[PDB]
Design a protein around this ligand. Sequence first.
Ligand SMILES: [Ca+2]
Ligand SMILES: [Ca+2]
Ligand SMILES: [Ca+2]
Ligand SMILES: [Ca+2]
Ligand SMILES: [Cu+2]
Ligand SMILES: [Cu+2]
Lengths: 723, 720
Amino acid sequence: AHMVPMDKTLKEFGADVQWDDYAQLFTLIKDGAYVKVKPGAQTAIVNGQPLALQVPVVMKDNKAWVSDTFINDVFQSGLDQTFQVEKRPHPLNALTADEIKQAVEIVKASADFKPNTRFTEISLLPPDKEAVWAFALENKPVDQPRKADVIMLDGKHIIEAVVDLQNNKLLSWQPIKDAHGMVLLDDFASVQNIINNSEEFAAAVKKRGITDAKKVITTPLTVGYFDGKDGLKQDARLLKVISYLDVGDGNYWAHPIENLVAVVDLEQKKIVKIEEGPVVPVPMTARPFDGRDRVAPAVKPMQIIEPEGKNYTITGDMIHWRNWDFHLSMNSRVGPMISTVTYNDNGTKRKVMYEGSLGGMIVPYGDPDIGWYFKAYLDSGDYGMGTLTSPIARGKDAPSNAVLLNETIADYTGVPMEIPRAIAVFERYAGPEYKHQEMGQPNVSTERRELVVRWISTVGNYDYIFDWIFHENGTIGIDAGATGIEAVKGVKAKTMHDETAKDDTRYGTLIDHNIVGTTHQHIYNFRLDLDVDGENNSLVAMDPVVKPNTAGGPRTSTMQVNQYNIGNEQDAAQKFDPGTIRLLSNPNKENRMGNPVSYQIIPYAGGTHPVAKGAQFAPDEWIYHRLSFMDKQLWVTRYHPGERFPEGKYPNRSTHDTGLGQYSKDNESLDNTDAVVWMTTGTTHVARAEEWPIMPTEWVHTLLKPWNFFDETPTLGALKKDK
Amino acid sequence: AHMVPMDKTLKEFGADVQWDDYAQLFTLIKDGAYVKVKPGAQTAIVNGQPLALQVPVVMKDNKAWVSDTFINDVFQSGLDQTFQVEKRPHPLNALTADEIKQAVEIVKASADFKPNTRFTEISLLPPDKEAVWAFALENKPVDQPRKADVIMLDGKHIIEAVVDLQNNKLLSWQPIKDAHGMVLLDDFASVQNIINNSEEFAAAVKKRGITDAKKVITTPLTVGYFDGKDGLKQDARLLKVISYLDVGDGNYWAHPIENLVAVVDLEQKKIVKIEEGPVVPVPMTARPFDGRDRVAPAVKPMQIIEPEGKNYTITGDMIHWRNWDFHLSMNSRVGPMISTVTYNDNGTKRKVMYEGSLGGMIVPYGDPDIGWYFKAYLDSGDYGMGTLTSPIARGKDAPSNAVLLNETIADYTGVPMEIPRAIAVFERYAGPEYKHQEMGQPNVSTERRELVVRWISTVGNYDYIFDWIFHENGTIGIDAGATGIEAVKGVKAKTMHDETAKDDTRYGTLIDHNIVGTTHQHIYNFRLDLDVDGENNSLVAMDPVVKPNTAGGPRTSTMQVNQYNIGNEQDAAQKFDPGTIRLLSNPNKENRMGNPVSYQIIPYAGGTHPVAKGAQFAPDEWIYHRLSFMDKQLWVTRYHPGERFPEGKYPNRSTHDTGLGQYSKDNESLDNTDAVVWMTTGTTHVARAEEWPIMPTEWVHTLLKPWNFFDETPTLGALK
Ligand SMILES: [Ca+2]
Ligand SMILES: [Ca+2]
Ligand SMILES: [Ca+2]
Ligand SMILES: [Ca+2]
Ligand SMILES: [Cu+2]
Ligand SMILES: [Cu+2]
C-alpha cells in the first residue's frame, strides 16, 4: 500500500542525495539525471524539465518519504535523454548474455565436450571490415550471421570452436597443438588449496619462521620459457607460486616470504618442485594502506554538475558527442574496444579509425634471484584484463559528473557475468581551446571540452587505468595510469647503514625496513586500425633538420624538413624520436592546400616516471627473444583480420615470437594499403619511499592528431556566409 | 530608505547571478563566495553559514531589489574566509602603488634625471635569503628598509639606480655602458607613426600593390647581433619593422607584405634603411578568428562549484593549501614569482623552494630571407611579459571555480598599473590519488586534487599560458601552453600543385592559399632555487643500466642503476635523457631508510608538439653563440643574488652570452652547496592547416617530485 524512506532507497539505487535545509530542496544525481525536488511539490525537475509526481515527497521526523514507484517515475521517466534505444543493431555489438548461453549450449552438445573444460574466451567473430563500414556509413545491413569465437581449455590443451548463432550450429572444432592456456580464476583457488594441503610446503615455511602455515597467502605466476634451464617440462600445465604472510593489516604484499618458490602441476594438482634460497626473516610490521590507522583530513566539497543533461547520447553501444560517432564494446582479454570512429566534417562523416584497443602489456622485473628471475606479467594475455575489470568508485575513480556503464562478458564456466560500473564516460573542462588577446582589442577565448572513456583493470597487486580521450578538434589521446601496491623483496637491511644494504639494493630501492621495491618496467602496446579518410594509407616520415643556408644573408643555417615514405613493415618497425613527425596519410585525398589528409602518430607524449627507451634486457634473454614488441615504439603492419596481439595469441610458455615479430616478418608493402598502427610505450620504474605502502597514480600519454586532415582550425564553427 | 536592482548591481560587482524559478532561490557566485538567498528571507547562506540580513531581498515585477548595503553586508561579512588580513608583511611583498610613486619621486629629484627618461623596470630589491627564510620559518622580523631597483632608459642609455624607500634616498646611480634597453610600449606607437609619415615607405608599399598606405599595420622586432653582417651599427637604438595589410577582418596577421623591412632609429625617430626583396602579392582573403563569420553549436552547461568555500587561504600574497605554504608576487619582466615554498610534514615545515619563476624564453625562426633571418622573440627579456599580462576571461581561460587576483606593476612612465584578473588560483579534480581493488575485498580509492596558479601573457601574435601546479603528495608541475596566431610568410603558391610550391615551402608548411607557417621553436627556461630541506644540496645522477647477471641462474642480464655525484657547473650543464633520473639531494639529511632527502628534476615530462632536442641552429650562428641556454635542458649553478636571467640582464643586441653561458663559466663546485636549477624545455613547431587561422592550445609539461624526501606515501594521512 505504502511508501519508502527516501535516503535508504536512493542510496541503494546509487543516487547521490543532497538536502538543502535553507532552500528546502533535494538534489538527486545519478548518471545522466540531475533532479531537483521539494517536499510537498507536485512537480520535480529532471534535467531542466518538469515531471508531474502522483505523490509528492513527504517530510516527517526529518525523514523524507517517497512512493515505492518514485525511482521509476523520476529516473526511468524519459526526461533523461542520455541513453537511447537502437533500432538498427550494430554489427560489432558484443555477445549478449543470451548469445553467450546459446554458444555454450552448442559446444556442450558436441560429442567432444568434456565436463572439466573451461572457457578462456567467448567473443564475437565479427563480419568483414568492408561490411561493417558500409553499415556505419551507408546504413547497409550486414547479411552475415552472428558467429562467436569459443576458446576452451581441456586440461592443458586449447581448442578453438566457431559457432553460428543464426543457424544454431558448430562450424569448427580445432585443437591447437603446442599452445598453453592463460591463467583462469579457479587456478587462484586451486593453487591456494594445493599449498594448503602440502606437507612438504608446511615444513619449508616453518623453517622460515612461520608457525601457523594457515596464514600463508599464495599468488600464481606464469613460468615463461628458458629453454629447459629453469628445469621445467614444456609439456605440463605449470604455475610458480610466491607466498606472503597474513599479519591482519589487510596488506599481505608487505610481508614477503623470500626465497621460497613452489612449482605446481595443475592437471596433477600437485607441487612438483620447491625451490628454496637463503632464509630471510619476514617483515612483520603492519602496513595497511586502507586508512585504518589514519585520520582523514577534511576537504571541502567540489561538485561538477551538468544541470541540463549531457552533451553525448548513447544509443545501444554507440556514442554521439559533438562531431564524433564511435562504437564501444568490451572484450574479456583486452577490455574496451573503440570501433567505427568517424568525424562529421560539415555534414560528411569521414573515417578515422576502424578499431582501436589495448594490444597487450608486459611488466618485466630485473632481479636474477629465485623468486624473481622468471617474473614478467603479461596482464592481458595471461590473466584477461577485461575479466579483472575493477568497478569504478563513483566520485573518486571518476569525477562526480560521469555516466557509468555495466558490461557483460562470459566467465570461465561459460556463464554471463555483468560487471557493474565497468566503464566511465565523462566530459571535462580542459583549459582554453584557443585564445588571442590582440592589444587594444576585445579578447577572443573559447573553452576546450574533452570526452573521456575510462576503464580500470586490477591484476593482483597492481591497478591500471586507461583513458580514451576525444578532443573536439579531432585529436585523440590515450593515457595509461598505474597505481596499486608494489611487488617487494624481503631483505635483511633495515636502513642504508646496515652491513647488507649495498647487496640488498643492487636491483631496487630500499623503500621500508627490510623491503626493497625491485626495479621493473611497465610496457603498454595499443593496436590502432586507423583508416585515415579511407582504408588505403601510406606511412610518411618528416624529420626536422638543420641545413646550411644556400640562399645568402647572414644566416649560416636553416630549419628544413626531411620527408620520405616508409614502404614496408620492416622499415616501419622503429624506435620513436619525439623530435620527429610520423604520419599515416591518405595519398588519394588532399586538403584545400593540396596536402594529403593525415594523422600524426605520437607514441610518446610524456609521462610522470622515467621513460622506457626499449626492453631493459640483454638481447640474449629469452623474454627479449619471445617479445619483440617491447623494444620498438612504432610498428605499422598490413591489415590481416587475425593479427591482434602484440605478444601473440597464446603467450603462455611461448618459445618464439608469434606476436608483432611474426606479423612484420613477411615484410609486406605499406604503399597505399590498409595499415594497422601499433604503439608501444612505457616506463622504467625505480622505486622511492613515497610509493610505499601504496603508489600514487603515475601516468603516460600518447596522441593522434589530425595533420592537414582539415582545411583550417576545426573548432571555429559553422560558416555564416556563402556556400 | 531605498533599494537598488540586484542584477545590475551584482553583475557590476562581478558576481554570477543564477535564479532558480522552481526553488525560488538566487545563487550568487564571486571568487570564494558561494551565496544562497531567497526573496523575503531574513537570512542568507554564505559558504554554508547563515547570516542575518538587515533588509530582505524584494521581488518586484519579477525584478529583485536589494538594499544599498547588500554587497558589503553579504560579501564583506567575514563568512567568506578565502582572503585573510596580513598583520606582519612578508619581506618579498612586491612594491605597492605607493612605493612605486615614492621610488619615481626619489629618482626624479636628482639633477641627473633627464626629462624624457622612461622606466624599463621598477622592482623590489629583496633582503638576504637568510633573513627571508627566518621570517617564513620563525617569524623573525627582517629589519632592513624596503629598497627598490629602478632601471631607466635615457635615450638609448640604460641607468640603474637603487633607492631606500624608508629613508627616502638615492643609494646609487649607475649608467650601464653598452647595454641596450628592452622595447617599451610607446615604441609600438612611434614605429607606426614613423612609417605612416614616411614618403619613401609609402612609395615602396605602392610598388607592392598598395594604393592606400594608411591601411598598413606595423610590428616592431629586435634586430639581434650579426657582427655588422646585417649592415647595422651597434651604437644605435634600432628596431626592424614588418608590415601587414588591414583588410578589415580583424586579422592583419593573415595579410603579410612579404620581403619589405624598414630599419628605424628610435633616437632619431627615422627610417634608416628600407630592405626590399621580390614582390609577392598580398594575401587578401578575409580570415577573421573572432567568430564574426561563424555560428557556434549549442553546448549544455557544466558548472564546477565549491559551496562551502575553498580549501586554500590567501593572507596578503601568501597561499596556504593543505600541506603547502608559498608566497606569490608579480614582476614586470617575468610575471609570477613563487617564493618561500614549504611542505608541512606532520607539523614540521620543510624547505622546498626559496624562489621559482619563468627565467626567460625565446621563439627563433628558421627562414634565411630578408623578413625572417634576424627574427627571434625574447618575449620576457625584450618585451616584458608581466607588463603584457592578458586578463583572464572568467570561465574560458580558467574554470568557473577559480579565484582571480589583481596585480600591480609600474608602467613605463613610472605610474602604477593595476592588472585586473592577472592570475587565477583554482583547485581541480585530477583522477584517483591512488587505488587498490584487492580481489574479494572492499576497494580503496582516494580522489586527487591539484592546486593550479595560472598566468597568461600575450606578445604580438602569440599567447602563452603558464600553470604552476601543487600536488597534495609533494610533486610540483610547471606547464606552458601556446595559442594565438602564427607568424606567416606570403608566397605565390595557392596549393602544393603550383610551380613555386616546392620553393615556397622549403622553410614551412603551406597552411592557406599564399600563406606558409614558417618553422620555428618555442623554448622556455625556468629558474628554480630549490633548497631541498635546507640550502646545502648536491646534484646526483641515477642512470638505469642493463648489466650482466653475475648472481647465477638462467637470466643473462639485470636491471641496475649507475649512481654518481655531478660536482661542478660545467658538468651539470647537460642534455636531458628522459630515461634517466636527476636529483637535487640534501647530503646532510636522510629519510627513515637512510637515504638522502631529495627532489627528482624532470625538464621534459611531455608535450603535444614535437620536442626541441636543442637549438635548431648551427653552432657558428650568432644567436646560438649569444644564447647558450637553448641547447641544454638542465643547468645547475651556484646561488648568486644577481644571476636571474637565462638570456642575460640586457639581451638586446648582446654580443656574447651574459646569461647561463656566463653563470656557469667560472665552473664552481656544486658539492653540498646552495644550488639553483634551471630547466630548459620546448618544442619544434612545424605547422599544419588545423592551426590556421587560430592555433588550438598546445602544451609542454615539466615536473619536480619528492624522492625519498618523505618516509612513506605522503597522502595516507596522519597516524591516529
Ligand atoms: Ca587501416
Ligand atoms: Ca605482415
Ligand atoms: Ca638553492
Ligand atoms: Ca657560477
Ligand atoms: Cu611499477
Ligand atoms: Cu609556434
